[PDB]
UniProtKB/Swiss-Prot annotation:
It is an enzyme of class 3 (hydrolase). Belongs to the peptidase M14 family. Its cofactor is Zn(2+). GO terms for cellular component: cytoplasmic vesicle; extracellular space. The active site is at residue 266. Binds 1 zinc ion per subunit. The gene is CPB1. Disulfide bonds join 61-74, 133-156, 147-161. This is Carboxypeptidase B. The chain holds residues 113 to 416 of 416 of the full protein. Residues 6-300 form the Peptidase M14 domain. Keywords: Carboxypeptidase, Cytoplasmic vesicle, Disulfide bond, Hydrolase, Metal-binding, Metalloprotease, Protease, Secreted, Signal, Zinc, Zymogen. GO terms for molecular function: metallocarboxypeptidase activity; zinc ion binding. It catalyses: Preferential release of a C-terminal lysine or arginine amino acid. Substrate binds at residues 64-67, 122, 139-140, 193-194, 244.
Length: 304
């Protein structure tokens, strides 16, 4: 049984992607953009009312297997889209004028493993040459200063960069989709936890994007909007100096493809529960995060 206020296993999220699409055919379609290491379908939802030459926003969740609140958020976003369409003026305008590509779980194999064997697993579940250690960090596997600072060359490490950029089937699938839809995708949003941040480029080096002032102002305003609901305090800024330097991240890669609005969200909390955020916080976390996502979306729409 699926619930938006609980953490759902992969079988349940998979079934949900089919059911939410069949229940909302005028607003949602579903495709698979590839398969994981273990052969699971990587589902992607296109959320929006059909129309001509619509720009798009791309949002993924579940890069990191243990960050269960991320997976919950992508589901919550779709929940909001279908529930409030027609009733809330902004969400309705967004869905009428833009498409949201929502990838509810990227690292499906890792997610399954957090349910079955090890709640604190992070990486994919692929093999590595010359060792029995498993997995690559998907957020060190993109072609963005690949395998330099904040990424490990050791396959037994939690930030292992992989054998090559896009070595993982999952990251290759996501990068292929973005490259194939680059002319329409205007913003890239990638949802993680924890530590309460809105990050933008760059993480792979201490450098700033050409539109730094714009991104800084946008992130600042999104954080302020998020705080209006429950007073939850987020920090923001370029990744390298706001959290830590880390190469091979998808947000930086997406930005370097020309997607000018590229953000990594780190959701609740600040470490009390960390990755094992209780189910009792799903609602509040998702609702406040919606305000930041809607703020960013509204900005993108008005600055086409
Ligand atoms: N969610 S997290 O704890 O893993 N934090 C992220 C931070 C991060 C964000 C953007 C680019 C590189 C790194 C990570 O991939 O390390
Ligand atoms: Zn993460
Ligand atoms: Zn709501």
């Amino acid at each position: 049984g699926h619930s938006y206020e609980k953490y759902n296993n992969w079988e349940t999220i998979e079934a949900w992607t089919k059911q939410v699409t069949s229940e909302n055919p005028d607003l949602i379609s579903r495709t698979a953009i590839g398969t994981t290491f273990l052969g699971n379908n990587i589902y992607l939802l296109k959320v929006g009312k059909p129309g001509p030459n619509k720009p798009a926003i791309f949002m993924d969740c579940g890069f990191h297997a243990r960050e269960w609140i991320s997976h919950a958020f992508c589901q919550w976003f779709v929940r909001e889209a279908v529930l409030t369409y027609g009733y809330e003026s902004h969400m309705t305008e967004f869905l009428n004028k833009l498409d949201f590509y929502v990838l509810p779980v990227l690292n499906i194999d890792g997610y399954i493993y957090t349910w079955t064997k090890n709640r604190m697993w992070r990486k994919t579940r692929s093999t590595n040459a010359g060792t029995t250690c498993i997995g690559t960090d998907p957020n060190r596997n993109f072609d963005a200063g690949w395998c330099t600072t904040g990424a490990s060359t050791d396959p037994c490490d939690e930030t292992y960069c992989g054998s090559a950029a896009e070595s993982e089937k999952e990251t290759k699938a996501l990068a292929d989709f973005i490259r194939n839809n680059l002319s329409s995708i205007k913003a890239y949003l990638t949802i993680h936890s924890y530590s309460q941040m809105i990050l933008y480029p760059y993480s792979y080096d201490y450098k700033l994007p050409e539109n730094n002032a714009e991104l800084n102002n946008l992130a600042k305003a999104a954080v302020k909007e998020l705080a209006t609901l429950y007073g939850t305090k987020y920090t923001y800024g370029p990744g390298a100096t706001t959290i830590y330097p880390a190469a091979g991240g998808s947000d930086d890669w997406a930005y370097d493809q020309g997607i000018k609005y590229s953000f990594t969200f780190e959701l609740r909390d600040k470490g009390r529960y960390g990755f094992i955020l209780p189910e009792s916080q799903i609602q509040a976390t998702c609702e406040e995060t919606m305000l930041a996502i809607k703020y960013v979306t509204n900005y993108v729409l008005g600055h086409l």
